[PDB]
Amino acid sequence: AISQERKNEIIKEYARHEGDTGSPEVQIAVLTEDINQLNEHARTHKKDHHSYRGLMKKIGHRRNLLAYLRKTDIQRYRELIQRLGLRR
Amino acid sequence: KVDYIAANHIEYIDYKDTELLKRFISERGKILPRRVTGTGAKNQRKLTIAIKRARIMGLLPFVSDE
Amino acid sequence: QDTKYEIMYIIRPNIDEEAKTALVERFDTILKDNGAEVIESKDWEKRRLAYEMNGFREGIYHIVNVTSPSTAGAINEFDRLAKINDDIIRHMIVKVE
Amino acid sequence: VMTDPIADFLTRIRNANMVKHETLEVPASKIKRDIAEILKREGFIRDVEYIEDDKQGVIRVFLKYGKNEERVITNLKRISKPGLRAYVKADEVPKVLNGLGIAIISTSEGVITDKEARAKNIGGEVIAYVW
Amino acid sequence: PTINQLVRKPRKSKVEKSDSPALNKGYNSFKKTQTNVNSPQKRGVCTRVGTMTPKKPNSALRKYARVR
Amino acid sequence: YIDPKHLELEDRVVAINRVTKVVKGGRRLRFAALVVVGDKNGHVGFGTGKAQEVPEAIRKAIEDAKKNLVEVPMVGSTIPHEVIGVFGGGRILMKPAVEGSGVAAGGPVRAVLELAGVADITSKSLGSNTPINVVRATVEGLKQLKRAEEVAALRGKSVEEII
RNA sequence: AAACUGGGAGACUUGAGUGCAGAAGAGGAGAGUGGAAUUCCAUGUGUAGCGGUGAAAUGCGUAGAUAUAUGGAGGAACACCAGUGGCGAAGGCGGCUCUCUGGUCUGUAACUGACGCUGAGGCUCGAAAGCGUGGGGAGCAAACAGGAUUAGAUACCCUGGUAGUCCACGCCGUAAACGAUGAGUGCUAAGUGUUGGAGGGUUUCCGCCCUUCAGUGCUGCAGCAAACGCAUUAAGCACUCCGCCUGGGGAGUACGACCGCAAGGUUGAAACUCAAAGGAAUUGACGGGGGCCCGUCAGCUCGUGUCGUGAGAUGUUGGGUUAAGUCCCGCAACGAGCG
After folding, report:
1. Mind giving me the DSSP string for F24-88?
2. F163 touching D, CB under 8 A?
3. Where would you find the membrane-spanning parts of this chain (chain F) (predicted)?
């Protein structure tokens, strides 16, 4: 839902080298922006059951990528989840 | 039978050029099928939206007997 | 960027030629006060209609050309004021591309 | 998703054999190359050529047919499966079709035929029967 | 089933039952009635006698008794 | 190919069947016969025919039975290896046996097996027991028997290299 | 001992995702708006019927009906377009404009580097009917009233008519919820339609030929099936994971337990009783099924072949002609007997 300038704005600060659109940092940060905006839209339109499906699938994708990042490098994982403000 | 919207290379329909629209409606005002006019699948969707737009803005009759 | 619209309304036929200019300028203003960059405003033609709307079988068509960001509360203001007037009969706002 | 590449190889061979045409290609692997050599040594395949560009593969097999276009391999079966593995002891090595067919066994000293294993007296994982 | 389904929940067969069930009995003397003691016969006292008519399509008056 | 019917052949009845067809009024009845045919040396055929009486039926069946015949290889009174023959709901397993053990086989399959000169073999029917389909499945399973010579010829090997 | 499965340190790009450039759509939520028709109301003209059925009657009408002309009020559904078309995980989604929003497809080759698949228990959604609170209510219509029909008619038919069908918010959680066909992945002849893209040629090709992705239909081979049939959209050949079955009744019943305002839903036996119950196809007989013909009818079977796993079929079906199974032509049939 975020514009195409917000997206590049936030993938230019979780990159690692240049040209770095992959790298699970980028993907979970952009997914976090999406999930926040969709939560807003749901609070407003709470009987849009057909958009809630997409919300839930984004949440599944993010949790999966987090599991991957943890199982391979705990330092990057901790530093991220501090920087991004989650892990309740 | 050639798609007259493909005769010219016409990009937009504009629902205002009631001269072009008026050849897809019968002698009573009803929309003619994609067969009797030989147009394509998507140009037909655009044409239908065009004349439905026209009828509302009073450029074109819904029914025409009186 | 922005989005482009085309507003098209139908004025009453039997008005004079100064209330008409007053109306046109009025709605240009009240479009612009909400951040709607108007970029064209014309008369079109005098036509008869295919059915009578209120009691009228003629009317004067006027079209405007306007861009704005998609969230500005401008183009709804036109609606809300136009459906309570006495000289306009119909309007159609339409995204243009 | 693919979970058994050895079974996929075997079913390519059987599928292209039953329709009776004379070539076949697979993505390569160290185990499939082994059993392609074992299939070539006994007389089921005619040849095998190894191309390789930028991913694993590939391996090309050339089937073989009789004098009246009848088939030299008649069927082919995967024994050990991911989900139920089959290990055999040196005195349990099987004899498929009373010696007229072969079994393929992986041992501590190669991927070998079932004759070569009951001549060495060892056992291991059982890959396939081809009769 | 897959063999994982089988390992999660095994196979169970059907249970057979006699057609002479009143011949696995137990006393009613001290406490209660015990079921281990399969007999080939049992004895009793006949509380009535008489006759009855068979099913379809036989026809007779077949002699019987009721026994405790 | 055609093993041509020019030998010394001992037939055998395997089944008969009273079969009707209801017509206007009452009922018609024929007799269907199932027969096997062989010489107890390795050539066996089956065939069936129907007529209005039992002798005429069995005759037409032997007529039919002789038109087909199979080769049935063996290696010293015992089948070369193990086969499973399937034809429409009849499944029959056959194994090589021990010298002087006999034939342990059911009704229909033992007729087929004995009239080809088989002496020592074990069988089992994991299927239906309708005589026609049992006979057809049994013959379907003999056709899979492979000689030891042919295998060595098809591959690039010799015998005593694969046995 | 070190091939395979597991563990540890690495490396790779094909699976999976991301970036960049594009495409289609009754996908969903909110807010306004348009015309056609039905009902009621108001007014003018207007004379005796209207309405309804297989026939009638009940009903409305000389307090001026029906018809006809002009004006208002309200509600619900969206003609043509419209299509074995499109979209959605399913239930489902069709007038028009704007706002907010989910997914799919195609090309490319910046990037990450196996991040994947399936999923008991758990959550979310789920036609119609039904339940609660407060609105709305034109047409249709359970229950109900009146008229008919019949031996009777607590039905079918006619005149009326309440809940409900509609909106907001809660509850319910079931359907022949069906393709009676769980999801992922690879492999195996061809021919022909249509929806959305991408490349090459001839080039007004933007209308034509060829190739290639993803949907959606028809025909058909190997193979499969008990037959029906299925067949690159498998019911074929194979691997992974889940759900479920084990003769018919008793019975989705009883008991216990969880859920629900209720109605009920989910879970789920045994005692006893029968020797069958089923699927698919075959020949007859029947139908308040259909078509052709005609005005002593023209039919009933066999032998050798071929077809079918089998009962069986073919012949004896088809065109024409004839009073005629009477003749000709064609055809896995060729001949024969009584008519």
Report:
1. SSSEEEEEEEEEEEE-SSS-EEEEEEEESSHHHHHHHHHHHHHT--B----SSSS-SS-EEEESS
2. yes
3. none
The domain locations on chain D are 1-73, 74-131
Contact of chains C and B by CB distance (3 or more pairs under 8 angstroms)? yes
D66 to F154: CB separation less than 8 angstroms, yes or no: yes
**A66 sits in which H/E element:** helix A49-72
Residue A3 CA distance to nucleotide G164 C1' (Å): 48
Q: Which CATH architecture has domain C3-96?
A: 2-Layer Sandwich (3.30)
Q: What is the experimental method?
A: cryo-EM
Q: How far is B23 from chain C (nearest CA, A)?
A: 17
> Domains of chain B: which residue ranges?
1-66
The contacts of residue C63 (CB under 8 Å, 6+ apart) are C6, C7, C8, C40, C41, C42, C44
CATH (residue range F10-67): 3.30.160.20
Size of interface D-E (CB pairs under 8 A): 4
CA of F86 to C1' of G225 (A): 13
Domain ranges of chain C: 3-96
Residue C14, classified by CB atoms within 10 Å of its CB into exposed (0-12), middle (13-18) or buried (19+), is exposed
Report the C-alpha gap between D15 and A10 in whole angstroms. 51
- To one decimal, the resolution in angstroms is 3.2
Indicate the DSSP class of residue C18: S
Residue E21 DSSP code:
G
Nucleotide nearest residue A17, measured CA to C1': G111
How many CB atoms are closer than 10 A to CB C88?
A: 18
Measure the CA angle with vertex B13, ends B12 and B15; round to 5°.
140
Domain boundaries defined on chain A: 1-88
Chain B residues contacting C via beta carbons under 8 Å: 53, 55-62, 64
β-strands D24-26, C88-92 pairing:
unpaired
Residue of E nearest to D85 (CA): E3
B58/C51 Cβ within 8 A = yes
